[PDB]
Amino acid sequence: ASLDPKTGFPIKLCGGSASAGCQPMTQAASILDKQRTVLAGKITVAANKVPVLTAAVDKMKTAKKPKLDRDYVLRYSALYLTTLVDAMEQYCLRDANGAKAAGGAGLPKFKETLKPASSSSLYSYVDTVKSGIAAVSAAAKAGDFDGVNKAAGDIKTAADSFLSTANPPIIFN
Numbered sequence: 342a343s344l345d346p347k348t349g350f351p352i353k354l355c356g357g358s359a360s361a362g363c364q365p366m367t368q369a370a371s372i373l374d375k376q377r378t379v380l381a382g383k384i385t386v387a388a389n390k391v392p393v394l395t396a397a398v399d400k401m402k403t404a405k406k407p408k409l410d411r412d413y414v415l416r417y418s419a420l421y422l423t424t425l426v427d428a429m430e431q432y433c434l435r436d437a438n439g440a441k442a443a444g445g446a447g448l449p450k451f452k453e454t455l456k457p458a459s460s461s462s463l464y465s466y467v468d469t470v471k472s473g474i475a476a477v478s479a480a481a482k483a484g485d486f487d488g489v490n491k492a493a494g495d496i497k498t499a500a501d502s503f504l505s506t507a508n509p510p511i512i513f514n
């Protein structure tokens with residue numbers, strides 16, 4: 342019904358009718374819906390790791406000689422924020438062009454010729470996270486501890502907002 346906070350994994354038997362059965366061979370979910378639960382689970386893991394940065398930045402400022410580890414803030418941004426932004430963009434793509442993005446147009450390639458992730462209803466939330474990445478990097482260069490904390494909070498609100506409007510089908514295959 343929801344996705345695990347850390348692992349991100351998902352948390353009726355009729356004859357002649359799929360009846361949205363969870364059991365395999367009775368599953369009514371499309372491969373697109375299964376791809377959407379995967380992307381949503383990956384969005385869930387990255388957003389739930391935003392609290393971990395907030396704690397690290399608080400430990401940095403409380404230290405006797407406060408210093409901002411540009412390397413930690415930039416490495417967390419490289420490891421979690423790129424993940425979250427790319428996954429949000431992919432969810433937006435699958436929503437905008439439907440099956441075409443699930444492999445219906447072939448191997449991922451340049452000149453995709455499918456509806457872009459931009460112009461999606463949920464794309465505005467992806468723009469908020471892109472601003473959050475820029476703030477996390479700008480604050481780290483500046484040395485502003487408060488800037489990193491709020492920017493991570495802005496990303497956390499945006500990712501939670503995305504999932505709520507997305508209403509991703511949770512599929513236990």
Ligand code: CLA
Pocket residue numbers: 372375376379380443444448449
């Ligand atoms: C065995 C290796 C393996 C495994 C387990 C996965 C697993 C995954 N990949 Mg990866 N991937 C792999 C190899 C693998 N990949 C390779 C080699 C490539 C390069 C071609 C990719 C390229 C790739 C991309 C580009 C994407 C994934 C995605 C995914 C996720 C969703 C699965 C999916 O899209 O199925 C989709 C499967 C198909 C479209 C067809 C494959 C054939 C199916 C699985 C078998 C059906 C059997 C059927 C019942 C019998 C025949 C029926 C008859 C009618 C024909 C999942 C985490 C997606 C994702 O969400 O991750 C971000 C995604 O966007 N993968």
